[PDB]
Design a protein around this ligand. Structure first.
Ligand SMILES: NS(=O)(=O)c1cccc(NC(=O)NCCNCc2ccccc2F)c1
Ligand SMILES: [Zn+2]
Length: 257
């Protein structure tokens, strides 16, 4: 049973999941003097249908907002992709304090949290379960979250947490378009990487936005007040769930800009 504490955390994951020391692990530090601009990269295009929003779930180490993924109502196209990728989830990562909650870093700078909007390749594969382990199976947009002014676009998400306070609780989460959470510019970096927690499959093409979005100290406190225990047990707040950055191992981060 993996987690983020000192006994089951990132630094121990390789014992149960050897891919943790792999050649395509995420997150990474994006060193902008080493990025290579690629004129062949097309703009990112997202088109999400709010009716695909389904459920919010406390998964112990985090919470997930899941989407109906039976058709192409909600898709990501463009960027480095020739295939259409189907939205299935978004979630966040955060840290113990405002100093350090993002997963990716830019030129060594740590942000306070990070938004992940995840998709799977429905042109090539028949389901998320099939796609999750394929090199070209997943596409995840990462948005760095900079502590500052309260972000009103987060309101529905934050308001839902009181119903899923403890591990395993879940609730309907409907009529929501998560492209409202993205920054106004979709200039991006892209690199081949992995899931940032077990099973850590090297199946993710990452799309990291250049522009950050805001989040307030108090909104971050709402994340950290989620509980990792089941109802009735001693309360254990979800204090952090970000993985340290991992070596590029010769990978190239491409810039759309
Ligand atoms: N931090 S991340 O690398 O952007 C990222 C992105 C998409 C999903 C997750 N986590 C998550 O799905 N947990 C449920 C675990 N069983 C479902 C499952 C298993 C393997 C792959 C995907 C998947 F959905 C994390
Ligand atoms: Zn994530």
């Amino acid at each position: 049973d993996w987690g983020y504490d000192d006994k089951n955390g990132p630094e121990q994951w390789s014992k149960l999941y050897p891919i943790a020391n792999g050649n395509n692990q995420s997150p990474v530090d994006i060193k902008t003097s080493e990025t290579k601009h690629d004129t062949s990269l097309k703009p990112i295009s997202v088109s999400y249908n709010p009716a695909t929003a389904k459920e919010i779930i406390n998964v112990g180490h985090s919470f997930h907002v899941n989407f109906e993924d039976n058709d192409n109502r909600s898709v990501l196209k463009g960027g480095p992709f020739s295939d259409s990728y189907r939205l299935f989830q978004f979630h966040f990562h955060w840290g113990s304090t405002n100093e350090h909650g993002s997963e990716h870093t830019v030129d060594g700078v740590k942000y306070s949290a990070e938004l992940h909007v995840a998709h799977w390749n429905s042109a090539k594969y028949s389901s998320l379960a099939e796609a999750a382990s394929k090199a070209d199976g997943l596409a995840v947009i990462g948005v760095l979250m900079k502590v500052g002014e309260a972000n009103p676009k987060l309101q529905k998400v934050l308001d839902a947490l009181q119903a899923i306070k403890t591990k395993g609780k879940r609730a309907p989460f409907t009529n929501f378009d998560p492209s409202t959470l993205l920054p106004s510019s979709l200039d991006f970096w892209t690199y081949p990487g992995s899931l940032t927690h077990p099973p850590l499959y090297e199946s993710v093409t990452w799309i990291i936005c250049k522009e950050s979005i805001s989040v307030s100290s108090e909104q971050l406190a709402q994340f950290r007040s989620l509980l990792s225990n089941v109802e009735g047990d001693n309360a254990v707040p979800m204090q952090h769930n970000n993985r340290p950055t991992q070596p590029l191992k010769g990978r190239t981060v491409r810039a759309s800009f």
